[PDB]
Design an enzyme around this catalytic site. Structure first.
Site, mmCIF file in Angstrom:
data_model
loop_
_atom_site.group_PDB
_atom_site.id
_atom_site.type_symbol
_atom_site.label_atom_id
_atom_site.label_comp_id
_atom_site.label_asym_id
_atom_site.label_seq_id
_atom_site.Cartn_x
_atom_site.Cartn_y
_atom_site.Cartn_z
ATOM 1 N N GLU A 13 -0.395 9.287 -2.669
ATOM 2 C CA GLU A 13 0.243 8.966 -1.664
ATOM 3 C C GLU A 13 2.335 8.922 -2.893
ATOM 4 O OE1 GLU A 13 3.410 6.852 -1.880
ATOM 5 O OE2 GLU A 13 3.858 7.989 -0.667
ATOM 6 N N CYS A 60 5.546 1.044 1.296
ATOM 7 C CA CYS A 60 4.737 1.861 0.818
ATOM 8 C C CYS A 60 4.060 1.160 2.309
ATOM 9 C CB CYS A 60 3.330 1.951 -0.030
ATOM 10 S SG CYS A 60 2.686 3.264 -0.668
ATOM 11 N N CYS A 63 -0.287 1.626 1.770
ATOM 12 C CA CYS A 63 -0.588 0.175 1.311
ATOM 13 C C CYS A 63 0.454 -0.826 1.630
ATOM 14 C CB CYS A 63 -0.561 -0.071 -0.614
ATOM 15 S SG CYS A 63 0.472 -0.177 -1.493
ATOM 16 N N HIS A 67 3.086 -4.925 0.242
ATOM 17 C CA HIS A 67 4.412 -5.270 -0.251
ATOM 18 C C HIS A 67 4.762 -6.916 0.705
ATOM 19 C CE1 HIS A 67 4.763 -2.614 -3.309
ATOM 20 N NE2 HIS A 67 4.294 -2.057 -2.572
ATOM 21 N N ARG A 478 -4.243 -1.555 -5.572
ATOM 22 C CA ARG A 478 -4.379 0.058 -7.093
ATOM 23 C C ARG A 478 -3.978 -1.247 -7.752
ATOM 24 N NH1 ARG A 478 -3.258 1.988 -2.290
ATOM 25 N NH2 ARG A 478 -3.816 4.181 -1.736
ATOM 26 N N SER A 501 0.866 0.896 -8.910
ATOM 27 C CA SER A 501 1.046 1.742 -9.422
ATOM 28 C C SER A 501 2.327 2.469 -10.907
ATOM 29 C CB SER A 501 0.945 2.539 -8.175
ATOM 30 O OG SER A 501 -0.402 3.288 -7.755
ATOM 31 N N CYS A 545 0.362 5.666 -6.135
ATOM 32 C CA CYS A 545 0.972 6.173 -4.704
ATOM 33 C C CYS A 545 2.076 5.878 -5.754
ATOM 34 C CB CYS A 545 0.697 3.765 -4.688
ATOM 35 S SG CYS A 545 1.806 3.947 -2.902
ATOM 36 N N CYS A 548 5.016 3.315 -3.941
ATOM 37 C CA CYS A 548 4.726 2.300 -4.865
ATOM 38 C C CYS A 548 5.306 2.203 -6.188
ATOM 39 C CB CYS A 548 3.470 1.955 -4.705
ATOM 40 S SG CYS A 548 2.609 0.836 -3.395
HETATM 41 N N1 FCO Z 1 -2.245 -0.772 -3.783
HETATM 42 C C1 FCO Z 1 -1.027 -0.520 -3.295
HETATM 43 FE FE1 FCO Z 1 0.338 -0.034 -3.594
HETATM 44 C C2 FCO Z 1 0.391 0.383 -5.149
HETATM 45 N N2 FCO Z 1 0.198 0.714 -6.507
HETATM 46 C C3 FCO Z 1 1.200 -1.551 -3.695
HETATM 47 O O1 FCO Z 1 1.550 -2.638 -4.102
HETATM 48 NI NI NI Z 2 1.646 2.117 -1.975
#
Ligand code: FCO
Ligand code: NI
Ligand code: SF4
Ligand code: SF4
Ligand code: SF4
Ligand code: SF4
Ligand code: FCO
Ligand code: F3S
Ligand code: F3S
Ligand SMILES: [Mg+2]
Ligand SMILES: [Mg+2]
Ligand code: NI
Lengths: 551, 267, 268, 551
Positions: A13, A60, A63, A67, A478, A501, A545, A548
């Protein structure tokens, strides 16, 4: 010495650049760079706390859900709200189902083409391919007829001369080790994975209102109206429908994804000995089941210097030791303030000055836990669960190990898990364990509704003066995610996201210490510096990601 | 031969690509193997780095005048483009290059259609829409955050099957998907008409499926097909049917501007 | 593990109510009969026939006395001592009364068993009546429609099994989750009705814009159901109005099979 | 010598009683009785011609769509309406998709348990079962793993002690000839069939508004509003959705249903030499494609004394030869007027007097064509298509014959089709050919909309004086259907349905000639008169629908 750049890294991503110095065909030093920023922390500032989750969910879409859930948890933390247990069950089902989709897509759609050679699948004998799986899997779609249909799909694509997204791949590379038959099996499973992940997102959709980007949360619980006897609301018919999709996930996860993970390890055992990113690991507990934002189904904790026997359990999202340890630096990032900042005091002031090897080179911040670099994500979550003596995790890992031992004669020890393949194994274990979370939480919801509890939402009050602070933790696909909200005079005065990430991909930190991506690449053999597949194999194991990481 | 598509992500969250993974007509596997030739897409490409950039260059030449260009995400103009750099160049330069040879150009999602969340509030990066960066071009806008993927897929199908875009409104949005206000085709309109409103999540009216206007529903000011097409092809799934007001994510000036609980203007 | 027993008897049925189960997805018919219930008698699916299947039924009525759910589709003809529907040489009204004696719950699936339906319409050649009329001393759960969405039935059975009692019912003993509201009081074309935006003929400009079907004879204003929300077949967007045709009122006694397609409904 | 009764006959639609005289272990004489009547013809009388279809559709829910379509065709015939070609395409897709569902369910859910012993499947070796299908089918779900899962579902049902609808069946009967492995294969395909039939009905639902009982027809066309650019109507997205389901049907039909049909014949070849019902056959052409209710994709005709070379083609639903031939008698039926009646002059006056071997014994009327008994349905339709030299039909039949040849070393000639198994084979051939009808008509609709034709409906006028007679013909799953409407002073003054199961199941006629069910049973061996499985095998081959037969 040679310098290479991989830009863009694909099958992630977002926007990532990786640079490596290579000395005699071995990576000696690396740099990770997030190359896109939006300023989502600044966008959400000066709004009503209730609104943040809809905006910051857009950090994101891979994912998705995460969030949104972290944001409502952060507001609930600030406001001291106890979320109704039915809202927890619903949130839990969504996160578990989402994470199932996410992990399956990561293994197949994002990662498999690092390890699988599609052109070699054309040479495969479909009958021999099927015979290789006898006594290895009970999956119902491993017949020679299935494999032949898939092989023909590949043959027809190649014959068209329009390979598109399969073009200019790493076909015939020396690091590709699967026999033709196993390459064909993997393509078949890649296509079958698409059906399974679709079923997972049907679960998410029926509770979230859609996916990507769910729309059923609130600061104070959820927007789903529970009424078994109501038309147009979350009634028994709707719950039965959700259950019908939950039940469709397990076979593919257990009989295909789990098995393929063991098999990739069997053919690539050197990848158990490289790609170590850190010696410290962190995860938060997840899936609360009480009326007070706790009693988590999955445990969390902190492992220092890879010592599982002395790990520190984390059993609460209000744990002061966890909270106080987290800081981020921008010394080698494109922001103005460089000293490590606790996120309630964080700033995000852009200060781009272009790429520099020894200066600023990334839009990702550098997080630390009491001054140390830490790897987050399914490797961390698996090691913490093993440190906790969680039998479910031990048993699931042992199932993978058993398949690996059948194929190789060897076992896996915990030391071998601090690696590229260990990280992939951790993710698979997580996806497997999540199927029981789904069954457990569906059953809990039906039972609780049966006791007469239809409550889903507690309306907040937000004092119009004063300054107060909250943090929402979540164990995302993640790794550990945290959203940090400061409210002043009823509006958001600071908002900081520290995303998994970010931990893994962040650049060199205030003490010039190297983060997990960069550390993991040291020692990577690169057969062909023009086609650095080995580098991408290790980076993809973290499931990057960058929307992210940077936000 | 299948019709070529080049997909470029700018300040995207990847949700617009992810919407394809929920699609059923076509499924993403039938899209890429049977319906189109997806010549560049960074999320799914086997190739990376120099190889994938070589793929894009070759495709832009081979299929000049023939490909559909799709962009997700907003395009940041502040500080000479540096808030989104791919292969060491501002994304606005990659987009403008690819637009030169395009047969049709589609802004998928609210971010590319009108700036979206990335352009909201203080707009830290000077994010703008695809149409703003391509003033000479007709950009087909498929808004939503993300849209139902078939709003995009049936637009592409119309181009492929009948040789021209679907009919568009004055914002260049396909009328089959965006031709009507959500409130002008919402199944809770009888409740609205009767003064039957949910006041809080979990209240008696909410638990009877009453209108969500007083929770902040933006249906009265948002064009879309969320109440009819809905999402995920399972039946009965959109935000209002699940129990939450429309936020106006399709609609510039509504989603990401107005508070969730802020009341909509009703025509 | 033992599954709850079900006895299904067809009277003056067209089999559409059984066929609804073959469209179901939660549960599918195969999961219904293998996992959810024990279908002890059903003439459309039973391996056994004739004397063997009648032996199955008598044995199950005995073995599961007080425990089984009895389901009837079709109307029950009373004219001329019940001879307009004879099974194994006896009137279906007698088979139904015998099965009802030991039932834990009794369900009329479809408009025919719920209120007489099409079979009782016009001059009612066979003196067709509803299941509740045949069983005055019993509480009959009515699941009308011609046929209903199968989940209106399946979620009713599920409520009985999972929570131990029927779902909440209205004054006509219809489950409120499915029949609690007029179609017109939860119809997505209500904005068009309100604005006077009406289709006048199939294929006209208004019809081709998805306008309200009231002037085509839509019976949504006088029909209780979930057709506009639950809809049909679980594919999304599928019910008669969405496809372009007015509601005929098939759920509702005195509407479906009584009023002409194009006859206008009374609006409250 | 003894007399038996089979009442109820199960695994049919509706209420059927069969009586047989058995002499020297063979059926010598049979009686078929429809034991339920509703009076649907009377219920629809005195109504508006436009309303009839919604009422008479409820003649049957198994063959839903058929009576709806025949009714609107009858009104259109009386009124001299030419149906818009888009409405023909839509009606055609619905009928073809419906019929696909109907035939699949007949072969598996209704008929297979006459020929398959589920207890015997428990003794099967799943690997041997799968091995038997190598080079016989390319279906992707014939693996040992699929068959093992299916065998375990059987084992679990048996272990529960609640066999339900599988209880007290004909397990170990001497007429059951399949090996254990083949019984297992059949049960796996029975379950797989359920998925395929559900896909076919999704096609029907998307055009019909629901199923059972579609709701998109009109006297004058259809209620679907075609507008590619319209929200909430039949637009391109909705058309793509329909196509996605049409595309899912072919593999099962071709690689499972077609193959199983050839296999049942291979194991039960004596059933090619019994169950002949008639020497005359009738079918009507179907799937009109022009603007004037003609140009049918499938041909029709009449075959007298099994002579294909001298058959009479029928190319029009207005064919006066067809129309003038049809009469019905109630000499041996429970109605008052006994002499043969043309249906425009038909009466349906109930006159129940109980069962009598030599008098009245059924609610089914006795239809004749120019005074002869005739078999209708898929055997008739196949024989007519062969007589017409239809290449598609020849080629499809030849595929089934080739599988049979490969398994047995013997061939199948046309004389062997006049039989229980020939009837089954005709049905399978029809189902296979219908998949090309679906593809053809979907493509025609797309192309026509592309020319700018969105017309779907022409509003009828009905003179308030005068008497108008119309007939609507349709080739239903079970054979030629006709609805006969007389309009007088604006309302229906007579309505008569002559339904395919009426032709086949009707009792002895005005000349005491025996109809197809009764004839087909003469000579049937019966090993155990208490459990007359052989009788039910032949009767099921006709796919009885007694709601249809009697109405
Ligand atoms: N899983 C995911 Fe996205 C990332 N790094 C978030 O929080
Ligand atoms: Ni993400
Ligand atoms: S429109 Fe929404 S889903 Fe699509 S890129 Fe923008 S934020 Fe993501
Ligand atoms: S305000 Fe929202 S929920 Fe209410 S009728 Fe309008 S669009 Fe529907
Ligand atoms: S209610 Fe309708 S579908 Fe059910 S038996 Fe009666 S006519 Fe048939
Ligand atoms: S008349 Fe029918 S189409 Fe119009 S709003 Fe009412 S129920 Fe809907
Ligand atoms: N097919 C069917 Fe039903 C019968 N017989 C009709 O028409
Ligand atoms: S928030 Fe967006 S998805 Fe539809 S319901 Fe409202 S336009
Ligand atoms: S005709 Fe029946 S199926 Fe629903 S739309 Fe009307 S109650
Ligand atoms: Mg941050
Ligand atoms: Mg008749
Ligand atoms: Ni029928």
């Amino acid at each position: 010495s040679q310098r290479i750049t991989i830009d863009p890294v694909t099958r992630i991503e977002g926007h990532l650049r990786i640079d490596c110095e290579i000395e005699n065909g071995v990576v000696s030093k690396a740099w990770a760079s997030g190359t896109m920023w939006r300023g989502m922390e600044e966008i959400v500032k000066n709004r009503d706390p209730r609104d943040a989750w809809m905006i910051v969910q857009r950090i994101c879409g891979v994912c998705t859900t995460t969030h949104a859930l972290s944001s409502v948890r952060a507001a609930e933390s600030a406001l001291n709200i106890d979320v109704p247990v039915n809202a927890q069950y619903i949130r839990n089902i969504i996160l578990a189902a989402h994470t199932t989709h996410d992990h399956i897509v990561h293994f197949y759609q994002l990662s498999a083409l690092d390890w699988v050679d599609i052109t070699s699948a054309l040479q495969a004998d479909p009958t021999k391919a099927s015979e290789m799986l006898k006594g290895v899997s009970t999956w119902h779609l491993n017949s020679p007829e299935e494999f032949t249909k898939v092989q023909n799909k590949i043959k027809d694509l190649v014959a068209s001369g329009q390979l598109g997204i399969f073009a200019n791949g790493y076909w015939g590379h020396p690091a590709m080790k699967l026999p033709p038959e196993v390459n064909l099996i993997a393509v078949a499973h890649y296509l079958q994975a698409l059906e399974c992940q679709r079923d997972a997102n049907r679960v998410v959709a029926l509770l979230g209102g859609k996916t990507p980007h769910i729309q059923n949360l609130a600061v104070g619980g959820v927007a789903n109206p529970i009424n078994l006897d109501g038309l147009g609301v979350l009634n028994l018919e709707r719950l039965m429908y959700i259950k019908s999709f939950i039940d469709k996930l397990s076979d593919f996860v257990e009989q295909v994804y789990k098995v393929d993970t063991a098999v990739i390890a069997a053919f690539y055992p050197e990848w158990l000995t490289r790609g170590k990113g850190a010696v410290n690991y962190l995860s938060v507990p997840e899936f609360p089941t009480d009326s007070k934002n706790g009693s988590f189904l999955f445990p969390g904790g902190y492992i220092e210097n890879a010592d599982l026997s002395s790990y520190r359990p984390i059993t609460s999202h209000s744990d002061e030791y966890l909270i106080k340890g987290i800081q981020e630096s921008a010394k080698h990032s494109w922001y103005k303030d460089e000293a490590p900042q606790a996120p309630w005091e964080g700033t995000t002031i852009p200060a781009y000055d272009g790429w520099s090897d020894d200066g600023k080179y990334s839009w990702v911040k550098s997080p630390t836990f009491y001054g140390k670099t830490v790897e987050v994500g399914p490797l961390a979550n698996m090691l913490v669960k093993l440190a906790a003596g969680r039998e479910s995790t031990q048993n699931k890992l042992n199932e993978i190990v058993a398949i690996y031992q059948k194929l190789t004669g060897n076992t896996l020890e915990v030391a071998q898990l601090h690696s590229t393949l260990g990280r992939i194994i951790g993710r698979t274990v997580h996806c497997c364990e999540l199927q029981d979370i789904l069954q457990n939480q569906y059953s809990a919801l039906i039972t609780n509704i049966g006791k007469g509890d239809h409550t889903t939402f507690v309306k907040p009050n937000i004092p119009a003066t004063g300054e107060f602070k909250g943090v929402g933790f979540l164990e995302a696909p993640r790794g550990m995610l945290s959203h940090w909200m400061v409210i002043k005079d009823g509006i958001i005065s600071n908002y900081q996201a520290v995303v998994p990430s970010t931990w893994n991909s962040g650049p060199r930190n205030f003490n010039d210490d190297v983060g997990p991506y960069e550390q993991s690449l040291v020692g990577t053999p690169v057969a062909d510096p023009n086609k650095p597949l080995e580098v991408v194999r290790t980076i993809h194991s973290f499931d990057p990601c960058m929307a992210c990481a940077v936000h | 031969q299948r019709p070529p598509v080049i997909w470029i992500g700018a300040q995207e969250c990847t949700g617009c690509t992810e919407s394809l993974l929920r699609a059923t007509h076509p499924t993403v596997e039938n899209l890429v193997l049977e319906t189109i030739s997806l010549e560049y897409h960074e999320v799914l490409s086997a190739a990376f780095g120099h190889q994938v950039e070589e793929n894009k260059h070759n495709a832009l030449e081979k299929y000049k005048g023939q490909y559909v260009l799709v962009v997700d995400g907003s395009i940041p103009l502040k500080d000479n483009g540096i808030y989104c750099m791919v292969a060491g160049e501002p994304i606005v330069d990659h987009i403008r290059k690819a637009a030169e040879g395009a047969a049709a150009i589609i802004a998928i999602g609210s971010c590319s259609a009108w700036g979206g969340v990335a352009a909201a509030g203080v707009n830290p990066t000077g994010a703008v829409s695809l149409q703003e960066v391509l003033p000479g071009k007709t950009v087909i806008n498929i808004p939503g955050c993300p849209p139902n993927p078939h709003n995009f897929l049936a637009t592409v199908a119309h181009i492929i099957t009948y040789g021209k875009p679907p009919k568009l409104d004055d914002k260049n949005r396909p009328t089959f998907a965006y031709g009507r206000l959500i409130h002008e085709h919402c199944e809770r309109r009888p409740h609205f008409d009767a003064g039957r409103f949910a006041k809080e999540f979990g209240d008696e009216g909410h638990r009877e499926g009453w209108c969500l206007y007083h929770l902040g529903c933006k249906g009265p000011e948002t064009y879309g097909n969320c109440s009819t097409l809905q999402f995920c092809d399972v039946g009965g799934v959109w935000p209002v049917a699940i129990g939450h007001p429309c936020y106006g994510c399709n609609e510039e000036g509504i989603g990401f501007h107005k508070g969730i609980h802020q009341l909509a203007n009703v025509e």
